Structure 1
């Protein structure tokens, strides 16, 4: 119900750095988000090894990429463990993350932005290509929620009464920058996935919309 939270100073600082950088290899955002999806799938698989009923909320383990061309949105969905409301608030903005200042110091020293994941803040690489993001998430322990950020110093968390039910897992909705619309294209997405996400334990599904003609 429109709960507003403030990003910690260090994350606000990181977001500003990333959204404005002219780094040349922006495509690594997709590697980082697929890695987060894979990690979340690892966690529900771990739980399911001891308690198989944890999968009943969504029996299939998958990563799914859904371009929304008309909206200029790229969706990245997983059926991983998901995040409760408290997880969203805690894990995506309010708690000091170990590595945030270290990564910013590495950047000042010449580090390549692709190293962002090694510092535990790979999620924020999405701001290389998007200026607005929604994170829709459903954990077995909670209702479905939407976390939302406009790249500023605040984010919101709201009970989800407007998006498709996930069953279980997380969907990132990336509102792409106007010069980054190549990541809506089937050919481009395939290229980036095959280059940077060759070794993933779960199927990576690409949803493509084609007209029926002739």
Structure 2
């Protein structure tokens, strides 16, 4: 499998470093942000399906799914949205403008929670995670895995190790030891009900209970 390496733009590498290092208190906002991206990605596939309902056939169910993996200290956020082609992942760039604007607003004293308003709320995941894999499948393209440690370099490899998505995106968040509360059914239920009431799509939570 060929791991293509790429370097992050200097503004993107500095944004990633700011968030991963910050002390922000309301770190739970990351979930609103990722859910909001997943909901938007679903809106995008649903729009195409208004024209062409064959676009939905790669994964007919439209959903956001939250999958804690206590064994691996991993929280996965999966959507069956539009997904991202390999070219998308290697060049993901409205980010450039929103990264600069958001950085200016932070100087003026904006709170970290305003990140979504500048369109770069994906990077809020580094509040609770030190490393991240992003697995994506766009309809007319193959399934790839993007990877970043918040440094200045990310990889994009063909996906030969993860479950097939059918269509969409799954973020594998490698949580920090301080933020392992977000693997908890009850803690995750709190954050979702608080900040994502108005989501057109089912937010499914996967829970592994032992049969007694």
Q: Which TM class, normalised by the smaller chain length?
A: over 0.9
Change (3 A) 1:96 1:211: closer
SS in 2 for 1:70: helix
Residues 84-123 of structure 1: per-residue CA shift (max 9 Å, x gap)? 10011111xx775212122112112111100000011100
The more displaced of 148-157 and 102-111 is: 102-111
Q: Is the 8 A contact 1:8 1:96 kept in 2?
A: no
Separation of aligned partners in 2, 1:200 and 1:33: 12
SS in 2 for 1:175: strand
Deviating 4+ runs (over 4 angstroms) = none
Q: How does 1:98-177 map to 2 (within 5 A)?
A: 98-177=97-176
Residues 47-92 of structure 1: per-residue CA shift (max 9 Å, x gap)? 001000000000010000000001000000000000010011111x
Q: Is the 8 A contact 1:97 1:120 kept in 2?
A: no
SS in 2 for 1:140: coil
SS in 1 for 2:13: helix
Change (3 A) 1:50 1:10: same
Separation of aligned partners in 2, 1:33 and 1:152: 21
Equivalenced residues, count: 209
What root-mean-square deviation, in Å, do the aligned CA atoms of Structure 1 and Structure 2 show?
0.9
Q: Is the 8 A contact 1:8 1:95 kept in 2?
A: no
Q: Is the 8 A contact 1:10 1:96 kept in 2?
A: no
TM-score, with structure 1 as normaliser: 0.96
Q: How does 1:54-133 map to 2 (within 5 A)?
A: 54-91=55-92, 97-133=96-132
Q: Match for residue 27 of structure 1?
A: 28
Unpaired segments ≥5 residues, structure 2: none
Q: Is the 8 A contact 1:137 1:146 kept in 2?
A: yes
Residues 138-197 of structure 1: per-residue CA shift (max 9 Å, x gap)? 001100000000110000000000000000000000000000000000000000000011
SS in 1 for 2:207: coil
